[PDB]
Amino acid sequence: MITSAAGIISLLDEDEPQLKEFALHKLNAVVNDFWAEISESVDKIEVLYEDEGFRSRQFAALVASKVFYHLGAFEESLNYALGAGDLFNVNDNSEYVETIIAKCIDHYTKQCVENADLPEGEKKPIDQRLEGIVNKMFQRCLDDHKYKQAIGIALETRRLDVFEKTILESNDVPGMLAYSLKLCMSLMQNKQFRNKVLRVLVKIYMNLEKPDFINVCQCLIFLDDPQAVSDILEKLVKEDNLLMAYQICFDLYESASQQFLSSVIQNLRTPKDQTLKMIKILSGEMAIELHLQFLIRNNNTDLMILKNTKDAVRNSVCHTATVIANSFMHCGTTSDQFLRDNLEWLARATNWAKFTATASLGVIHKGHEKEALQLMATYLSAYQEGGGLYALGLIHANHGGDIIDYLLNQLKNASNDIVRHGGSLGLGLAAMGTARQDVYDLLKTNLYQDDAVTGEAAGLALGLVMLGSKNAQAIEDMVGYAQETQHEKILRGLAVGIALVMYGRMEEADALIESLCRDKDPILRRSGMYTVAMAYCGSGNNKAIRRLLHVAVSDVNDDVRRAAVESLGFILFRTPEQCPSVVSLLSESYNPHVRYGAAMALGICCAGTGNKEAINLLEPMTNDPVNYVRQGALIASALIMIQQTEITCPKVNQFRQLYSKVINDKHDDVMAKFGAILAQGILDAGGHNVTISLQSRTGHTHMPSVVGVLVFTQFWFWFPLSHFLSLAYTPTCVIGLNKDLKMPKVQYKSNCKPSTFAYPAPLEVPKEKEKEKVSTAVLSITAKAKKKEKEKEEPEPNFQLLDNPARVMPAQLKVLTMPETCRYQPFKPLSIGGIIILKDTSEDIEELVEPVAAHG
Amino acid sequence: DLYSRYKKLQQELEFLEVQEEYIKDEQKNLKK
């Protein structure tokens, strides 16, 4: 062949710019093999490139890029490949070309990501030829009929114009939009870039031929743009399209927060019956009413298990545990049959147990907003009055409003510190997220005292009221009072309060997080852990995970370690499969507090998911020698398996037997029994009608649910707050509404066996076992006598039909439809669930569904 | 498809490395 390029390299050294270029051409032809020799002589090619050149400036760049690529210095190869210009010839099946393309793409993505965060004008310029190579790759991918993943390259490079162009000028615009929204909600982290991408997405949505108003409202919820959603609704109502607006407002209530809803309602305020009932939808009157009606209609609660627990109870701890479990199993059902039957049992309570019992009443009557006030007045010392306040606040959940003035006035005119605590809790629950200045200032005044019972509630209610607001004044005041006070109970209240305050703010919470973590007060370090959780809620942020995991082993306070693990679960709830990997090792920790935190973190993360590895980890923990680790494991298992059948999870019956055994035991610890009783309550919560999921049906984080789970986890310090989990109960209902906003008798169709999503069967009394003679003894001739006596002598249906109030389990929505496409057609697939505006084409009598009385 | 898988792998790598950091620290404390 040639066996040596030395002659070709030597041709370069000459002074003739006609010999030099032929040398370069042969050298490029042979660089496939002789890069080894050419590398030592590259410097000559370098200087030859660095001149006028006369086609040397062109070809030497490519030659040097090729030799450097072969050598291994891609950083220097890129510069010369770029300098080549038009000689790169991106369109060719060459490995050198492919590798330099990859390196250039990586360099461009890095440069764009780096310089995007910098100021608008302070940007380090990009190389125009590098941009041209990137755009050539974009256009080649487009020409290859490979529209997808050009969006991915655009996302990585942080340039939108290409993203918009490729997602528009492409086939299957709906599919590409769905893929883009999945990417924008799930994978990408940068909030500013996410908002920019979503702005582009909504612009595309609106400019589409038939705008997808539901996805537009979802993106607008993410962007926090009540003015824009209000304008969209105004246009949608000016144009004759009412079912669109109905479902838009339902989803807006189900996803957006109270502040956003209030702002959009105000914008709308700024026939009129349409606007009035739109305001009513957004306020949520019909949403809560329909949920309460759904639960009462389907209140398939089981009383024998609660009766057995009551029979087995001996101690006040287990008594309040049974009260709370009844509350959970009757939440949103307004049926207090157990409490109205066991008046002696319920009356054996004292002190804060009466507080807890009244709170249980409130949770049971959750959503029962119409007869409130007078209902509690009928239902009826200082502890009873405070419990009534707290129960009424629990009934008036995040959606409060009218009753805020009543709570404010009576908490002003409250004398007993117990009553003040209860009223502060109720007012905080009612005003959660409102950020009302008057309520906040009244709670500030109530907190500004030296009394644990009042201060704890005052601080927690301050947190609930200021939730998400990020109010600098609120943070300053709460931290100052926490530092200046002397009551650890007030400190705990303020810790949870600050955590709630700094909610939903991903990176704006980091200064406060660092301050609290570096603070020397262990309760304030716990507050820092909770602030991390609330700020990086449901984001899987690796920085926050690293902080929490570091504190779980470096800190000295077991309380702070446990809080760190709980916060870890709160962060990772969005990827349930991911958390067990973290918590398998933590669960096997010699520190019982860290073990309990691991259990509770698994519970929060896989709440209402029924994962398998989580249960596998919990079961051995359920069998531990330490007291409270067992309680945590039991409660976490209940959280995980809430609304799960034996077929769906072939261990639910095992854990039901375990709970029954631990309750019916001689030596089982008081707190283990408490945990088991709670576990039963959560497992059968809402009469098998409600599940616990921290995120909405559309993926948006559910602020009431996360707040409820956090405050419930903060029952280790205060039992009455254990009822806050009521906020975390979401009805697993698919409800069809027609144009009249009344529920018609529809027949939903689910194609699955009627045993994977059916209610657990009632188990009846265990029946009486008589005394048995033991294996009548066999004698020598007994067998002969027996011989003498011997001589002397399914369909499994594959179908499921559900009435219009349809308790459809979260996994039982993907498989759901109607028979033969009846008169009613769904506005959106029967997979998202929730409340669907069933459009109707056939006109008939259209009989409605009765509004069952609210008694159970 | 490919971009989603790539992002999944990137996140898995970050998660695994933070987990390893935690295990190193916990091992140190266990030795103490």
Curated annotation (Swiss-Prot), chain A:
GO terms for molecular function: enzyme regulator activity; ubiquitin protein ligase binding. The keyword Phosphoprotein applies. PC repeats lie at residues 356-382, 387-420, 422-456, 457-491, 493-526, 527-562, 563-595, 597-631, 632-672, 675-707. The modification Phosphoserine is found at S780. Keywords: Acetylation, Phosphoprotein, Proteasome, Repeat. The modification Phosphothreonine is found at T776. This is 26S proteasome non-ATPase regulatory subunit 1.
UniProtKB/Swiss-Prot annotation, chain B:
It comes from the Eukaryota. It is found in: Cytoplasm; Nucleus. Belongs to the AAA ATPase family. Component of the 26S proteasome, a multiprotein complex involved in the ATP-dependent degradation of ubiquitinated proteins. This complex plays a key role in the maintenance of protein homeostasis by removing misfolded or damaged proteins, which could impair cellular functions, and by removing proteins whose functions are no longer required. Therefore, the proteasome participates in numerous cellular processes, including cell cycle progression, apoptosis, or DNA damage repair. Component of the 19S proteasome regulatory particle complex. The 26S proteasome consists of a 20S core particle (CP) and two 19S regulatory subunits (RP). The regulatory particle is made of a lid composed of 9 subunits, a base containing 6 ATPases including PSMC4 and few additional components. Interacts with NR1I3. Interacts with PAAF1. Interacts with TRIM5. Interacts with ZFAND1. This is 26S proteasome regulatory subunit 6B. It comes from Homo sapiens (Human). The gene is PSMC4.
